[PDB]
Assembly symmetry: D2
Homo-oligomer: 461 residues x 4
């Protein structure tokens, strides 16, 4: 068809709230054809590996309740994926939806010349919400943009001081824009795109001595380290918790060598680990803090890079040194201001702690019961993972859970590991249903394995 015809057919679909069997069958059939012909036929192959065929062709339609998703066939899913840590305050949180709706009625995007007042308000808010000397905020549209901004603040601070080297950690995930991907550590994500930014070096996560070595060797050779960047807990790494005091030691180590400390709280921020930021567990103040995902309330894309006056002041003489067109737009600021208001009003950080403790205990118990399938369960607050024995078992679990209308998925920088990242608003009853679904899934998986194994050993001579 013409573009006009397709743009029309699609606006008509946006208005529709419901689909009869025929409208559903037609839309499902279209979305699969169009993913294949215009988006990525690879996404259809992946979703098959993590489903029992026919289930891969599930099409999102609307939010059910705070903690559920409904497909085009009316099937309601409990959300333990949380859009990879976006939906901290649930799906269509009425307070966030309200703030966005209200700003949409006045001015959704700004001129970038007149002072936009929600930018000023969210910056003031984030300054009050953040620890210590974190004071200035730069707004962008994603995690990867927030990391680019951080790397850039560090570069501008440190190049006149003669420092250009950056240290990241293996298993680390900081985004996929080429500046961010220089810090991202997974080989398969980096190799095609090399050469990446020069002067990026990786040490093991949670190993302070390896990091000391790297900083010291860089100092010896005249390749002095501008910054260390790390996640307080590695998400895509498979929920990798550092040894206690590690973050505090990295801060002293950065202080000693005159390197800037960059904390990537894109995925651990906005209450998910049981505090507003995972750096609050140790009362660690980085030089630069990166936020996205949940900051937009599961309604708007937004990122934020917050830094000390000492570091951020690099942008004061020429405020156009770093810019973006959409960053700090009124819809996004409204969504973030709502999200902070919701998390604080309802003490959802405290809820994440209680519910995470409850869920992790549940999973650790299933791990004890199914060591043939599960290596270990880890977490902190509502950031959790189950590591299975091998990759194919992890995929069978994702499918079994999906069959039972519970939504989980794999981690990026870690195969065979399933993230459990539900909304902080997940109810105690849903928490219990999740554990029962997990149990039913593991029992079904054990049968599959035992069956196969008989149907194999038969082969001999």
């Amino acid at each position: 068809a013409s573009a006009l015809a397709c743009s029309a057919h699609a606006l008509n679909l946006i208005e529709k709230r419901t689909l009869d069997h025929e409208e559903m069958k037609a839309l499902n059939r279209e979305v699969i054809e169009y993913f294949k012909e215009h988006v990525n036929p690879g996404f259809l192959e992946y979703r098959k590996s993590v489903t029992a065929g026919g289930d891969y062709g599930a099409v999102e339609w609307q939010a059910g309740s705070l903690n559920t998703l409904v497909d085009t066939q009316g099937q309601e899913f409990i959300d333990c994926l949380g859009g990879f840590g976006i939906f901290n305050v649930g799906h269509r949180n009425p307070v966030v939806v309200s703030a966005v709706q209200n700003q949409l009625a006045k001015q959704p995007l700004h001129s970038q010349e007149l002072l936009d007042p929600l930018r000023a308000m969210l910056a003031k808010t984030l300054a009050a919400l953040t620890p210590g000397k974190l004071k200035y905020s730069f707004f962008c549209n994603s995690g990867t943009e927030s990391v680019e901004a951080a790397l850039k603040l560090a570069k501008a601070y440190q190049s006149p001081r003669g420092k250009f080297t950056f240290i990241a950690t293996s298993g680390a995930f900081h985004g996929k824009s080429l500046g961010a991907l220089s810090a991202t550590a997974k080989s398969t994500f980096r190799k095609p795109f090399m050469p990446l930014l020069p002067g990026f070096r990786h040490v093991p996560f949670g190993n302070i001595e390896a990091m000391r070595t790297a900083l010291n060797e860089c100092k010896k050779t005249g390749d002095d380290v501008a910054a260390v960047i790390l996640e307080p807990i590695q998400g895509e790494g498979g929920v990798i918790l550092p040894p206690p005091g590690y973050l505090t030691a990295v801060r002293k180590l950065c202080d000693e060598f005159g390197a800037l400390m960059i904390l990537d709280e894109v995925q651990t921020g906005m209450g998910r680990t049981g505090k507003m930021f995972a750096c609050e567990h140790e009362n660690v103040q980085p030089d630069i803090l990166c936020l996205a995902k949940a900051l937009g309330g599961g309604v708007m894309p937004i990122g934020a890079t917050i830094a000390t006056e000492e570091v951020f002041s690099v942008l004061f003489d020429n405020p156009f040194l770093h810019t973006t067109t959409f960053g700090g737009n009124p819809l996004a600021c409204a969504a973030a201001l709502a999200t902070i208001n919701v998390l604080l009003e309802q003490n959802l950080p405290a809820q994440a702690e209680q519910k995470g403790d409850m869920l992790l205990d549940g999973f650790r118990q299933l791990a004890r019961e199914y060591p043939d399938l599960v290596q270990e369960a880890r977490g902190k607050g509502m950031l959790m993972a189950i590591e299975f024995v091998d990759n194919e078992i992890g995929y069978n679990f994702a499918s079994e859970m999906f069959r039972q209308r519970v939504l989980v998925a794999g981690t990026l920088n870690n195969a065979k590991t399933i993230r459990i990242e539900p909304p902080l608003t997940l109810t105690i009853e849903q928490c219990e249903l999740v554990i029962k679904a997990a149990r039913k899934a593991l029992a079904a998986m054990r049968v599959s394995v035992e069956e196969a194994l008989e149907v194999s050993a038969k082969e001999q001579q």
Copy 2:
């Protein structure tokens, strides 16, 4: 206060549609204090340079009509800034607002595990809307992200073919993320952040022979070019139009050397130049096309990177090779689908042509009338610029226009140049009001100058010769001070003082 207290005070402000004198005075005072203490005190200094004091402290409040903005004091501005090419279909275009409102009621952000249907629909739409073999779309949240995606598609296609070098053009602006900024060409934007991506080289824009040379020399030395990236017309460069046929020649040149052609239509896309894409003027099909700004309808942030099946197929075996969390979200897709529907239904590309022709004629005439102030006016469709004689005159114009409630601003990779980028929906009457405002501004500027001052010729010529004779400067330094002096004759006293200092210092 607590964060809770500030988040509350701010949600209260989001609900309010009106401000009495007291609410306005209190909010203005807050926004200025908070910009200074938590955003950037630099932005307050810049806005002063481009206003008569008290005017710098104008605070955005809401959209007036399709083509106007209203501050906290109720002053309505005609928008010739267009948010730097975002507001193609105007402020709160009811069709776009409607689509976003409708999708917000179902699902604003997606899971990233279930197939999201608006992604599929917008991708199908963009495939039909785009020229030739452009077929696959990757959605992100900004121009800079769309450029990163393009660079990444090229890298993945070309590294197994042994090609790693990228060519961009001087004056070029492709974004500020470190991959994008490797292609961005302005010194002041790059130097603090070097070293940038290796293998990035710059040729003059609109010079096919310089580009041939660069590709050929790279081939000779074994540093073969993976891709050429260029804007069809340089926006931040100051609306720099290439010679006609240039784009067509770059395409044949890329075809000959086996390099991928990347077109950055972030700022020339969605009808702004008089066609849906500026590559349609010459019927040029790039390998990879970058879109953002206007694609979101002035409601949502979105970027799109569209490419051939041949190039994009690099993402098919591992679909996680390039991803983003928010990219291709349902709100953004709804906003884009609406925007395309609006541009096509109302033939706004055709309107941009007519209104741009009208506005450019107006500006070229004011240029004829005020050669003491204006060097030249250029444009294509509703992408236009006025180059003034010097930077300070450009700033005086922006201020005079703002005094008269018409919103313009400067370009990034070009000082003393004012962009005129109004909504394609600007009415013929507003077009005329814009020209009258410009005229009034230039007349007032002439008076300011003529306020017992203007001539300074020999005053300048004296500085040229004194600077040239100072015996302790090297030839790069003398050359840097004389380029400053002829480029901006109104700083001859300042530049002379500076040169005398450094001459004394090398005795």
Copy 3:
């Protein structure tokens, strides 16, 4: 065998001045086996492509006269290869051999702690010999080392000034050490070894406007140029002469943008183009000058990097910033001091001019006569090339010349192009014999072709 046994057999061979048929046959057979098993079996394949089989297995033995080489079978060759521009003052120039012999009797290599007096003397000599404000000399062991030193002087001068980009030219050859190879321009020499030094960009040779563009674009993007490096005439490029005034323009262009001018006279230096340095043709003073090959007199390996006090003074606060163990050794300095003495005493620069004019005229005439085989002949002084129509014809010429006991070979950054780089001491009679050999070679090549059909 043991190493002791092989080191013994070889010292025995070094003492021998003559080989009977049996000693020759045994040594030839050994050298081919050992090239194959321990050096490079590739060198044996190349030498075959540029010979009529049996001729590829020629083994160097000794210098004949100033301008000839003798193989193990006693066959004497007129040398028009000149070891690629080493043998400017001939083979075993008695004045150079004498100086080396004399220093070998006192101290061949230095301590690197006591002031070594020939270093001081050769540096003083090179300062007097070089144009203008070229004053300080750093001694190394090769062309590539002399270029590394130049690149390093530029880096140390310009990094505190915020400039890091370097411009070289396509067809350019500056050596094969990884710093030098970043400036070297031929793809097949660079691709395996990438990534090379960052911030190295190439413009066409002899195109001042292309170079202006590159400097200007680098300035616009904040990647300002530290230095331009170029050969005054590209040797490995195939004897590529720049347009007149080009070098002078590059100097003004460097002056304007505040970039350092590096001239690589490794192959055009020590009189080969008709002056002591090719930069003297236009009276061009670079910031940094690179020398090797002929500077050692065809006896010693040496390189020299000479620069202004302004640039070299980067090494004054810490004189260990750039060092080499063997560089500026007394044998090498003795050899260079002798070589300069010989070139000046006998006005061999002037001879190179006259003999090059004579030889080039001869070749241009053969080009007129054999356009089926020869595209063109070029040169300046005793730096000359014949470009053939295609690569295989160039190889047939090298072979035909070798069959007639005249030694020529191909260029590096240019196929199908044969360098003629004889000693400046080549006699007028030899010059004429060379032209007659070339004629006989082309006539035989024409027959081969006409045959084939």
Copy 4:
């Protein structure tokens, strides 16, 4: 003057074997003026810091015996500097001088088109002399060129295998050419010349776990290691001996990750540590071995890069991929062939062991006696160092030794550390004279210190 005039005056000086007081005074005065005006006035400042003035202006004239140097004033020095590890077989070793003299009479430099037979002979010799599967030799003119060749062999082998990262060690010294300097580890030698080759990372020397980490992390991030390069013992680092088995472990570690092992034996090679190569102590076979300094016999500049057929075969299809004009020249080959013959015939590796053990014991004993001045003495064979308490004490020792006509000097990647690198041919009596000179030097230094202190205290009491 004209260049002709100076080239003449200098050839006149090359012929002279003797200088009366007037010829000496005139030549010394010239050499100092010319170092200042045309070489480096910095060399004159450095040599002052390591002498009592008047002594800084000592000018080399000729070799005395195998193990001594004579200045323009006829003062004979015992050589414990060894030209930083060049003079393994002494000054003007008659066997080396003979081979060079003999080849000079036939063909000193080659055409580079005809097969040069000494290249073939030295390559065959070095193949027999080297351990295991080391088979192919490429000849150059210096240590830094030999390292460039190694880096290049690795790059050509490993880039088609998708590996581009190189690991070196801190304190490491591999040369000053920009490829080599990318592996060299001292800050002050690198910073002015950055950016250097990309893909170069440094681990601590003698720390196998730090190196494992680096290889593993590079593998995880897709920046896989092409090669490890290290000295078996760091010379410029200040004679840093790795823990025993380190080299063996690095070899297994390289084998595990598929990285090439490059051993830089430029300074530990040709018998200096008590074996022909320091890699023979642990029977470690690297993929690529680098040689220079002593390989030329203290007569000729030469470097050699030797590698497996597996690695070197990258140069077989295009033999012009890596070349040099002077490399593998007949004089240099003659000098190297002589040097190998001398080292093997006279078992100088075994002598280096015995004499080094003797000298190191002597120094360790002086360390016990002078802990106020000396931190420690280390070595292996005739590769030795004395670390002093502070830099200025190190310089006072170098001066005191020079005053007593014994030649020592500092290390590059280590201040306050004096290298003792005498010819392997140093006689037992000279060994003893060296120890006595060291003793006399330390005793004089102690008196200087003790005197200062006495002067201070009395002035104070006097108040």
